[PDB]
Structures are given as structure tokens and as C-alpha cells.
């Protein structure tokens, strides 16, 4: 299994939709590699369309909680929660390969949450809190103001690898190191 061989080389794939099953897989892999060696860098290759905000912040907190530095490299896409997890890497260690796209947007409810307006007021204050928490999370990791994140993530803002470097989501557009 090439997944297990890269895991022994401290390489993790965020390669699927960020849901609770994916989040538990990342958090188990992050906490094992913290317990294996807290000094060596964990590499988090991210090819993901994003997903749930809770599973986002489950991975986000675990990336920030573990003693090991998290090298986030984007490959193909980091959209939504995955763009935030891409920005959630250790500063100086956030990469994207040159043709990876980075989609940042405000949080959204999938489908329709029914309920009384008092329940919907709480669901809306929560998705506004999820919006504010995402923008605050993207503020401290991109170096931009949270109001700048709010205007930019008002709709879909797809960045290239170069544009995500200028935005502060990654730190280095990862050059191709092919020998030929």
C-alpha cells in the first residue's frame, strides 16, 4: 500500500471530501505521527473539495494541536474546508503545486434545514459564526484582515497556486524538482 508507505514517511493525504469519517482518519494519522516523532514534519498532501465545517475545524485544531509541523501541499484543488486546511499548515511550510487551484468561499448549508424560525435563527447565527470563524481562521493564516476575507469569500474565489501565494494561503508555489 502506497498510502501506508507514505504514512511511514510522515505523509498524509487529505484526498477526499472533508467529512467526519475523513476527519477522524486525518486526526488519527496526525496524532500517531505526533506520538511517533513530534519533531519531524508531517506532510499533508491536500486534494480535496472541502466539506463540513466541524470536520474542517476537527482537522484544523488537530493540525494546530500536534507538536509536529504540518507541511500542507495542495495538489489539484483545496476548495472550501480544504483551502482553510491548506492555509492551516505551518507558516513557511504551506505549498501548492503550480496548477493546483484554491477555492475559498463562505460556509453553506447543504440542502435545506427545515424548522421553526427560532430554530432557524439559531442555525443562521451558527452559520454566521461558522462564517466568522472561517474568516478569522483565514485571517491569522493568510495575514489578511478578516473583513478582507469576508469580501473575498463572499462568493467563490478560485485562486491559482501563485494567487494563493499572494493571498497568503500557501507560502511557496512548489517548484517541479524533476531531474530531467
Amino acid at each position: 500500500n502506497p498510502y501506508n508507505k507514505l504514512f511511514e514517511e510522515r505523509i498524509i493525504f487529505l484526498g477526499v471530501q472533508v467529512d467526519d469519517a475523513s476527519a477522524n482518519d486525518i486526526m488519527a494519522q496526525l496524532l500517531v505521527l505526533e506520538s511517533l516523532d513530534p519533531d519531524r514534519d508531517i506532510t499533508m498532501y491536500i486534494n480535496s473539495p472541502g466539506g463540513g465545517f466541524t470536520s474542517l475545524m476537527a482537522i484544523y485544531d488537530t493540525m494546530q494541536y500536534v507538536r509536529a509541523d504540518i507541511q500542507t501541499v495542495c495538489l489539484g484543488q483545496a476548495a472550501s474546508a480544504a483551502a482553510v486546511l491548506l492555509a492551516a499548515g505551518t507558516p513557511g511550510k504551506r505549498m501548492a503545486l503550480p496548477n493546483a487551484r484554491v477555492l475559498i468561499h463562505q460556509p453553506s448549508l447543504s440542502g435545506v434545514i427545515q424548522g421553526q424560525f427560532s430554530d432557524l435563527e439559531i442555525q443562521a447565527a451558527e452559520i454566521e459564526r461558522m462564517r466568522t470563524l472561517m474568516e478569522t481562521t483565514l485571517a491569522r493564516h493568510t495575514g489578511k484582515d478578516a473583513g478582507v476575507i469576508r469580501k473575498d469569500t463572499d462568493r467563490d474565489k478560485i485562486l491559482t497556486a501563485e494567487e494563493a501565494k499572494d493571498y497568503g494561503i500557501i507560502d511557496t508555489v512548489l517548484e517541479y524538482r524533476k531531474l530531467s
Binding site: 421553526q116 424560525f117 442555525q123 443562521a124 452559520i127
Partner: protein, 178 residues
Amino acid sequence: SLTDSVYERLLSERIIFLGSEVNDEIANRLCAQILLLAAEDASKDISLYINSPGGSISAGMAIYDTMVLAPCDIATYAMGMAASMGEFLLAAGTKGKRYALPHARILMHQPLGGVTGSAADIAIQAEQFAVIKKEMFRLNAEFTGQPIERIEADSDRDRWFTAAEALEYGFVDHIITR
């Protein structure tokens, strides 16, 4: 159909029916029936018998505005069930002419809805849910003659009424005891 014929013959007797879930289809049907009966005679009352589980606010607000701006009085009749929007349109009748049949049930609750889309869409939906909730509660305050704070506390979940309880709360003005 026979059921359309019997409703047509009571439309001739100025008796209309909120007899289902108030969606846009039967609201425009009821609004057209109120406009037609106000065009026939602007003086004789329209009897709106309400057997309704509730429904859309704007469909019921369409009926409510058509009830008020009709120059003739809209006598409302709680018949079995006046819930949610049908409760609203029951209490939206002309004062003194809001009637509950003695075993009709009146359900008053805060409006139901759904949030969807992005967080900026939902925040607009929430602001509009707060506007719809305030206008539904202010008009239920105006109908029942009770404070909007009592309407807001009582509609927070489902509050059921008998005909006697809806009489003392203010949804209806009499209980028909023929």
C-alpha cells in the same frame, strides 16, 4: 365535479372555504373569490369557513390583504382546524364576526421555514424570518387584542386552543351555538 359545484353554490351564498393547506394555488383561488364577491355586492358579508392546517405566510398574507381591502366584512369560521396560517386568517376576520365552531381547534405557532444556500443567503433569510415572525406576531397581536410579547411567548412552539380557549385568547369573537 360535484365538489366544485357545491363550493360554487355556496360561493353564490357568499360562503368560501379555506379548506386545505394554504399554498399559493388556493390562496389565489380564495383571493379571487373575495374579489368576485366584493364585486357582486360590497355590503353583504363573506363567510370564510376555515378547515386549514396552515401553510405559506405570503399565501396567507395574500388572503389577509384581500380580506381587509374587501369593502365587505369577512366573517371567519373555525371549522375543525384553524392552524398556523389558517389560525391567522381566522383571527384576520372582521371583529365581531370571527366565529369558532365549538369543537374546532386553533393552533398558533411561530412560522416554519427553511434555510439553504450560502451563509450570506441564510443571513438574509434570517433577517427576513425575523421580519416575517415580527409581522406575524404583530398582526396576531392586533387580531387577538393581546401584547406581541404574549404572542411571541405563546407561539414559540405549538399552542393549541379549543373554541373556548380561542375565544378568551382573541382569535374568535363568538362560538356558534345554534
